[PDB]
Amino acid sequence: THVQGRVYNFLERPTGWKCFVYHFAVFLIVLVCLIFSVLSTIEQYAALATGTLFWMEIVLVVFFGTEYVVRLWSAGCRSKYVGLWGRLRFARKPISIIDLIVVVASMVVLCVGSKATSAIRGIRFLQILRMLHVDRQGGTWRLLGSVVFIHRQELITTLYIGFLGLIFSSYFVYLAEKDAVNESGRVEFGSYADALWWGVVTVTTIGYGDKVPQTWVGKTIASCFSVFAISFFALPAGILGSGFALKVQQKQRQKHFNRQIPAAASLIQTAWRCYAAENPDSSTWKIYILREHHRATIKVIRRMQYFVAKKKFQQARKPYDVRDVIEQYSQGHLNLMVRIKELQRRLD
């Protein structure tokens, strides 16, 4: 059981030079796969090629089917998925669907597609789908989704405006140039849709050069609109950039936390004790040493302390704040003035 745990850890959250390198190695092998498969259309070597290629494809799909299943059974350490139904639920994860489809597709298409047009049109699909697994870690994907969800408003707005102005400037241009004829004899801006394409090609700094306005009015609008809205278009890149760099910075601060430990122990023991309360015969009474009314009030105080620890723990995870400082200082000061009245009074 220990070995499966090590193996699953090795596959899922591996570190050290050999492990990452192992994956790198399998990436070199799939490279050789592509080299030979594309060399198969070169006739000087199509003899060697036809031998090593039909082989190679099956070698891959077999090996991958194996590593997959190895992974799935060794994945029993996670309590969610330990056990049979556990693996079934485990399969519920996305990347499970991913490698599942990759291997089964390769399976069916190399079992029947061997002896056939859409078969090869699918075999390229497979060479594509197989490389998906190279990252394999899932925690930070959430980070991305987070930042996006936070800034959804701006992005939405910017996109709206830019796309819009595209639309408009396109209209004016189309009306401006729908009469000119290219020097090569044709008319560039046939319909509004042409100009629209041209626009979007422009506004994003691509500049194909297939469609260019002729009359100074056109060049004018192009210039103004481009120079203006282009910056709006490139904003989400800048935004997200700064977003990540910021959030990263804060996380890098969060690394330091320790207060989580005792808060955790507390919260735990509180909640367990609370549950244990529901048994009037439990041992928690040994604290107090018949109890006609003390029961209910006890439940109260216990729940109270529980809530305290709960919230406080949530705080035991969040960075310190001028809030905390202000609060605790004011409090300590208060307690202090209290003690002053205590000794003033004592002197009374």
């Binding site: 059981t1 745990g5 850890n9 350490c77 996670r78 309590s79 969610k80 330990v82 989580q260 430990i261 005792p262 808060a263 955790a264 122990a265 507390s266 919260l267 735990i268 023991q269 509180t270 909640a271 367990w272 004790r273 609370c274 549950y275 244990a276 439990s282 041992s283 928690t284 040994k286 604290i287 107090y288 009314h293 003390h294 209910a296 009030t297 006890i298 109260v300 105080i301 729940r303 109270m304 302390q305 529980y306 809530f307 305290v308 709960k310 919230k311 406080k312 723990f313 949530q314 409090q331 307690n335």
Partner: protein, 144 residues
């Protein structure tokens, strides 16, 4: 809910002990001291600030009923406790050692009675190399 609010008024009367309708830090401290507890004043203030929603510093009866209404067997509270278990979890697989839990429960934070821990350990299926699935505890103590 009339028997529930009857019991909640009964329990509120055990704290009130007069016709105020509010519970003071003193008015709870005397009750806790009648149990032989000796809490701190800031402990009582941290206790009381988790109940009121008026900011006045005492617990009215509707604050008492809102506290007593809302449920421990929750979507969030289960996940909070599950995240709380993971500090003491090596490798994060969903299993902690038995003696590690006994060392933690009797030393860290509020130190438990050994009879409490002897009940707590035997509440879960402990064998199988000594590891225990703490989500079994969480389902147990979130059965309410």
């Amino acid at each position: 809910t009339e028997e529930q609010i009857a019991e909640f008024k009964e329990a509120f009367s055990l704290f009130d002990k007069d016709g105020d309708g509010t519970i003071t830090t003193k008015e709870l401290g005397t009750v806790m001291r009648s149990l032989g507890q000796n809490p701190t004043e800031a402990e009582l203030q941290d206790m009381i600030n988790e109940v009121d929603a008026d900011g006045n510093g005492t617990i009215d009866f509707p604050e008492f009923l809102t506290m007593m209404a809302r449920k421990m067997k929750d979507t969030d509270s289960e996940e909070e406790i599950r995240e709380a278990f993971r500090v003491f979890d090596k490798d994060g697989n969903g299993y902690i050692s038995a003696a590690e839990l006994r060392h933690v429960m009797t030393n860290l934070g509020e130190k438990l009675t050994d009879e409490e821990v002897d009940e707590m350990i035997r509440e879960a299926d402990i064998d199988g190399d000594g590891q225990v699935n703490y989500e079994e505890f969480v389902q147990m103590m979130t059965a309410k």
